[PDB]
Design a protein around this nucleic acid. Structure first.
Ligand code: CA
Ligand code: CA
Ligand code: CA
Ligand code: CA
Ligand code: CA
Ligand code: CA
Ligand code: CA
Ligand code: CA
Lengths: 299, 299
DNA sequence: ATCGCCTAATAGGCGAT
DNA sequence: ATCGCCTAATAGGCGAT
């Protein structure tokens, strides 16, 4: 199966990736389109999102005796691992609501690695936006929840959540991304993205990758004497440029105007030097364009 | 938030769980309804499921240099960890298709633990089926993929994927399941389900839990000289009774007619004695009713 | 057939500096 | 503020018996 459509994918990928790389504005258009599409959907279904999210706390009796156990160094002991509440009540719910949009068609293309949510989003809006280049994009959305004890202004991303330059030299070969040296104010690390900047499906469909991050932020009610629960406080939305934009054109990752866009992640010295996660600073990403947004969900 | 609707949930849960327990046929009806609903949907969208699944192999060049690394004891070295392909192309796709059914409404109720897919499925069909008892159920669906080198006739389930008796003695307390001693032909282990047999939402909604397992089975093409890829071969569907049916009425877990329905799982002697996974033998589960089905997807 | 040996990959709370 | 210390929970391939 590996070789059946390989030549056609190879030829199309290389011709199309060059075009994308030389015309960064097209990718930026569809990336902002994806971002604003999530913002719209969260806005149009705010009560539902908050209700199904916060419902986890009301269902407390059903899981109180079997909560996810604490993990990490020195847990304070008053928080409940809230990872899956944001993943389902926010992340999965959004995937369904996006597909219910009148003009949008969703296709779950099989891939062995990647973010929480992945799907080919096809729509006539993308066709005009890209002036006929394509009518589809590969949505790569990952939910990153935090409480009042972690930073609400960063993103810690795994290699499988970032795309690179994706050179594909020879046919019998494949896409390869260059290692990147992340230099922060005090430390540095290597970061190697594993995702290609775009995909070409076996039927010739051109699917530039659009990386979106949804960051639900909960409040710890217990921080207030005798109150209980971890309620939906806000949701940050962030668009991270695909690999061509980050490392090729306009090369945001190397622009002095945006120093420390990337910084060392949370992986410890026991992790493989090539699988370490990287941080993206939302305060800097906020300067390269209308890439970040905050929605108040505490109402 | 923990106490705001607690009394109402408590009162309703206990009255409703007693009714469910004493009328096992209602739960069996909705459980078989959920099973047959997935069978219908897989059947009505077979080309799409197989196409988006198998597409992962055609996209080989895009991930060949960054495949999920091998894990476990003595990997042969010719297989690619295929976990996420089945999760998305089959599991996530089904959740969307079920919600697109005319008469079905889906709600992603937040929960901190549980299976791959979870959602409140509401429909008038459930209302007549349960003769007015309720119009909703909590779908608990987990995707379990296997290749030609693991058994296509079992399921290895985590505590968070099985419900128990769910006694809830006192209000300020919560649901609790009894530990179960799993006795297999050569070994034995404890198994402690963490999920309640039903949920009551803060608005009084009665949501009996319906546990469904989707088992995509891929073929290893490479097992045939020079061919490549891991293609969709079959999909097994299995309905596992909720906790009331397993351990209370009719108590399938303790019925001599179904010896070894459950058996020790895959967790090693280094795992907490209370978090060990348990196996469910599909060949036995197949005897307690029309709980198991096989769909040929290799066409 | 039984069953458990064995490890990749994801996640974010929280302290140390 | 920076950044990495630290561990729960999920998963199924495959050998050992
Ligand atoms: Ca605690
Ligand atoms: Ca639509
Ligand atoms: Ca994830
Ligand atoms: Ca995530
Ligand atoms: Ca290999
Ligand atoms: Ca519907
Ligand atoms: Ca899972
Ligand atoms: Ca699963």
């Amino acid at each position: 199966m590996y070789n059946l459509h390989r030549e056609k994918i190879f030829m199309s990928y290389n011709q199309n990736k060059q075009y994308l790389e030389d015309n960064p504005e097209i990718q930026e258009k569809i990336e902002l389109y994806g971002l604003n599409l999530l913002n719209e959907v969260i806005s149009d279904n705010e009560e539902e999102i908050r209700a199904d999210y916060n419902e986890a706390n009301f269902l407390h009796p059903f899981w109180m005796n079997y909560p996810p156990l604490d993990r990490g160094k020195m847990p304070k002991g008053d928080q409940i691992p809230w990872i899956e509440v944001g993943e389902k009540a926010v992340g999965s719910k959004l995937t369904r609501l996006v597909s219910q949009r009148e003009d949008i068609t969703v296709r779950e293309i099989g891939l062995p690695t990647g973010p929480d949510e992945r799907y080919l989003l096809t729509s006539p809006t993308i066709y005009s936006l890209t002036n006929g280049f394509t009518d589809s994009i590969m949505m790569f959305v990952d939910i990153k929840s935090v409480g009042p004890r972690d930073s609400d202004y960063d993103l810690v991303l795994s290699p499988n959540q970032v795309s690179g330059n994706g050179d594909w030299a020879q046919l019998e070969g494949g896409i390869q991304n260059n290692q990147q040296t992340i230099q922060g104010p005090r430390s540095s690390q290597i970061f190697l993205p594993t995702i290609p900047p775009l995909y070409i499906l076996s039927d010739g469909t051109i699917a530039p990758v659009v990386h979106l991050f949804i960051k639900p932020i909960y409040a710890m009610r217990s921080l207030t004497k005798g109150d209980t629960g971890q309620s939906l406080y806000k949701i940050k939305l962030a668009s991270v440029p695909n690999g061509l934009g980050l490392f090729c054109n306009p090369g945001y990752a190397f622009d002095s105007a945006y120093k420390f866009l990337f910084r060392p992640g949370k992986d410890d010295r026991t992790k493989s030097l090539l699988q370490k996660r990287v941080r993206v600073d939302l305060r800097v990403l906020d300067k390269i364009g209308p890439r970040v947004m905050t929605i108040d969900m505490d109402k």
